[PDB]
Structures are given as C-alpha cells and as structure tokens.
C-alpha cells in the first residue's frame, strides 16, 4: 500500500483536502446570511463538539482500515461491524464524495476560466457611480459563462469556453491523481498550500485598504466578529453552522478516511488531525472571512452586503468581489489572483473527494491506479453534464450529498465506530501512536454529546425544514434525484462484485 512520505506532506495534503471552495465561497455566504457574529458562536461550538471529534474518528477509522488494505467505508464499516448492512451503509462513503465531485469540479472549473479571462483582460468594463451599472456587467459575465436561463425552460447553455475549461480542469485533476499519493497528491500539496496561503494573505491586505463613503473593511470585520446572543435560540443558525463545519472539514465525505488509510499503522493521528483541522479553521475565519465580506461591506454597507449574500451563493465570489476590484487600479489582476486562489483551493479539495472512488477500485476491485483514476474521471465527467445543462441540478446534489448526506454519514460513522465497534476499542485506536493524547473529556463528547447533538439536529431539520423541499420544488429536481439514486445502486452493485471477487479469491 502507498503511504505518505513525510509528516509535513501528510499535513499539507490533509489541509488541502479541507481548505477549499468552502472556506472562500461558502463560509462568507453562510456567515452573512446568518447575522455575522450571530453565526460564529454556534460555529465555534460546532467545531469543538462535532468538527474536532469527528476528524479524529475519521483519521482513526482510515488508519485502522489502511493497515488491513482497505481505504473506503464499505470495507472499513464491515471491519468494524461484520454485518452486510455495514457494507451497504458504507456505500455512502463512495456516493457522497462522488456526487459532491460531480458539481464541485465544475464550479472549480469556473474559477480557472475566470482566472484565464481576468489574466488576459477579457472582462467587462463598467461605465466611467450607480451600483447596478457596476454590478450588472459582472452579473452578465457570469450568466453568459454558465448559461443561466433567459426564458422559462430550466435549461443551461454553458459557453464553449466554459465547457473546454471543464475538460482542462478534469485533465489537471487526473494528472495529479494518476501519479498517486506521495508522488501526486503529496507533492502537489507542498506547492499548492504555500501558494494558497500567500495569495490569500495578499488579498486580505489589499481588501483591508478598501474605504468608500459607505464604510471600511473594518466595518465588515465588526459585523462578522460581534456576538449576537439573541440568535442562539434560532435552530436555523445551528443547522447552518453544523452544515458548514461538516463541509469545510470534509467530514462525512469518506475523504478524510481514505487519506488516513495511507498513514502508517504506528503513525500519530491525534496531533496530525488536530493540526489539519486547525489549519482549515484559520484559513476559514481569518482568510476566507476577511476577503469577501469586508470588501462587500466597505463598498455597500452591512445591509446591502447581507442582501447580496442572500440573493445567491455565487453572487459574492463571482460577481460582487470582481466588480468591487474593478473600481481599483490593477483590479483586473487582483480578480485574477482571487480566482487563481479559488482554483488551487478547489483543486486540492477535488483530488481529495475523488480519491475514495479511486481507492475503492484499487483496493476492492484490484484495478491499477491508472485505470481506477481514468474510470473515476469518466464517471465524474459524464455525470457533470447534468449539472452543466440542467438548472438547479447543482443545488439538488449539494443538498442530498453535500448537506444532508454528510451529517447523516457523520452520525452513522460515529455510531459504528464508537457504539457498535466499541467505545473503548475506538478510544484506544484513536490514541495509539499519538504524539499527544486526546483529552479525556472528549471520550464523553464522542460517545454521548456528539451523537445526540447531531441526532437532534437531523430531527429538527427533517421536521421543520425539509418538507418544503419535498413538496415545493420544480419537477426537474426528480431528474437529479433519479440519477444520483441510480449512482447509489451502481456503487452498491460494485460493492457486491467486490464481495464475490474476494469470495472467489
Ligand atoms: C454533450 C456535450 C455538449 O457540449 C456542447 O457542445 C457543443 C458542440 O459540441 C458546443 O458548441 C457547446 O459549447 C457545448 O456546451
Ligand atoms: C482555453 C481556450 C478555450 C478555447 C476558446 C474557444 C472560444 O470560442 C468562442 O466560441 C465561439 C467560437 O466557436 C465564438 O463565440 C468565439 O469564436 C469565441 O467566443
Ligand atoms: C443531462 C444531459 C445533458 C446533455 C446536454 C447536451 C446538449 C447539447 O446541446 C446541443 O448543442 C448543440 C451544438 O450545436 C446546440 O445546437 C443545441 O443546443 C443542442 O443541439
Ligand atoms: C438536460 C437537458 C439539456 C438539454 C439541452 C437542450 O438543448 C436544446 O434545447 C432546446 C429547447 O429549448 C432545443 O434546441 C432542443 O430541444 C435541444 O437540442
Ligand atoms: C469541549 C472539549 C474541549 C476541552 C479541551 C480542554 C482540555 O482540557 C484539559 O485536558 C487535559 C487532558 O485530559 C486534562 O488533564 C486537563 O486537566 C484539562 O483541563
Ligand atoms: Na474547508
Ligand atoms: Na482544497
């Protein structure tokens, strides 16, 4: 089995797994939609009661499985709980990252396309003033790129450039993954994460210099970091905070587990896992939190910035920020640096969420790495045409896999590892080889607080929010639901074939 070559490479690869589009695009929108500082108290508590403990649990499960030649949850769940229902539940550890990859890599390809166009200066020129006259050319730029519907049909028509850039993006992902763990993912992380950190710090510094008649970047930081204890009673904020914690740390994707399956059986995971988790949170709240929101607040004020965040999920990062930059000398190049930052953040995450399918084809069906990578890329590239051409298919996949799925799977993996496998056996496995020990209080958190916290979350979610999404959406949501359900059945069939191959061997 491949292993990570160095401790630093392991940490930077895991940090690149975590640090992605969720830090720089998702977190600012989630925080702004939910009152800024009102969002941060639940967010911090969720990190301490969910993020950290599940990170350690996923590192432990992966290292445990890797020592027996298994890096994905169908086999690992079965090692922890010899029961054919364990293999079936483990399919979600292939399905969730595959479904997320199907729309994550496409969004990633937008950042590359925008980076290219901004580098070469093929960008809108606002009029030499009214905010709408500045924002509209950049809204039109995005809408022409992804092909937003101009009539009533729920149909997208991406530009030829966007389609080609998606092929290029897929090719870049493949060229890293096909070289493997140490010579591919690890080597790239050592280059990408330093670059990513420098670009982000430079953009924060540039954004901190923004000042208009409507405010300063400081006004944005006060909005994000000022507690509002009245919102501690709103379940929606807690739901939003925990969902972001899952998404930003790659928890419930089966991806941390697969990466940790390449950690040597004796090697520490307590300190390594905490460091990767801590690096992501720094990149999230310090870097991601200090670029988009302060820039938007400085130019428009809190109320307009909040409304911009609510209007869309891509408004802030693809329309508003480049528009703001356009009003400053060298703003087109700053836009390039922003989208180049997003691309590297995205790329280091998309190789991580495609590796589980690769590891399954290698570990369980005994495919060569070459064939495993090429077939995985083929499945993602083909399936992505649904997200490219059907309006709101992206949203449907992000909900079932990237929102509900991750939380459900995090509770599932905790119950399997800490209740069924055994809390004391799980606790020993986490701490074995640790440079540090997990604090004893966290044994009680993992066994009792974390599962109850999530169970309550999922119940209030399913009762007071989800029904709207099962009765109000447009009929085309069933196209995406049908397809991703078919993907689950396809992956279940592959697990079945892996069973019969081991039976026959
Ligand atoms: C199925 C993939 C369709 O892809 C489409 O292909 C057309 C010709 O191939 C191009 O002109 C379009 O830009 C592209 O979106
Ligand atoms: C990486 C580079 C991507 C290839 C650039 C393709 C851009 O081609 C585009 O599509 C149409 C041409 O068929 C026309 O609109 C223009 O020629 C151009 O806008
Ligand atoms: C979910 C499945 C999505 C497949 C969408 C592929 C649609 C390709 O679209 C085709 O592109 C042509 C290029 O000449 C255009 O004339 C038309 O839009 C269509 O014929
Ligand atoms: C997934 C569905 C995406 C298919 C893209 C359809 O593309 C085109 O749509 C137009 C209808 O308005 C017509 O040009 C044709 O029916 C079709 O080729
Ligand atoms: C919520 C969980 C966050 C609490 C982590 C604080 C660590 O707490 C420390 O851990 C040590 C190891 O058990 C103990 O020996 C110390 O007495 C304890 O204060
Ligand atoms: Na993240
Ligand atoms: Na990343």
Author numbering: 5 to 132, 135 to 511
Article, verbatim:
LeuT, the bacterial homolog of hDAT, has provided key insights that have improved our understanding of Na+/substrate-coupled transport in the neurotransmitter sodium symporter (NSS) family. R445 is aligned to R375 in LeuT, which forms the R375-E6 salt-bridge as part of the IC gate.
In all structures (superimposed), L-Ala, Na1, and Na2 (purple spheres) could be modeled into their respective binding sites (left). In the absence of ion and substrate (Apo), LeuT WT dwells between OO and OF conformation, with OO being predominant (black trace). Leu binding to Na+-bound LeuT restores the conformational preference to the OO form (blue trace). Consistent with previous findings, the spin label pair monitoring of the IC gate in LeuT WT showed a bimodal distribution between IF and IO conformations in the Apo state (black trace), whereas Na+ alone (red trace) begins, and Na+/Leu (blue trace) completes, biasing LeuT toward the IO conformer (right).
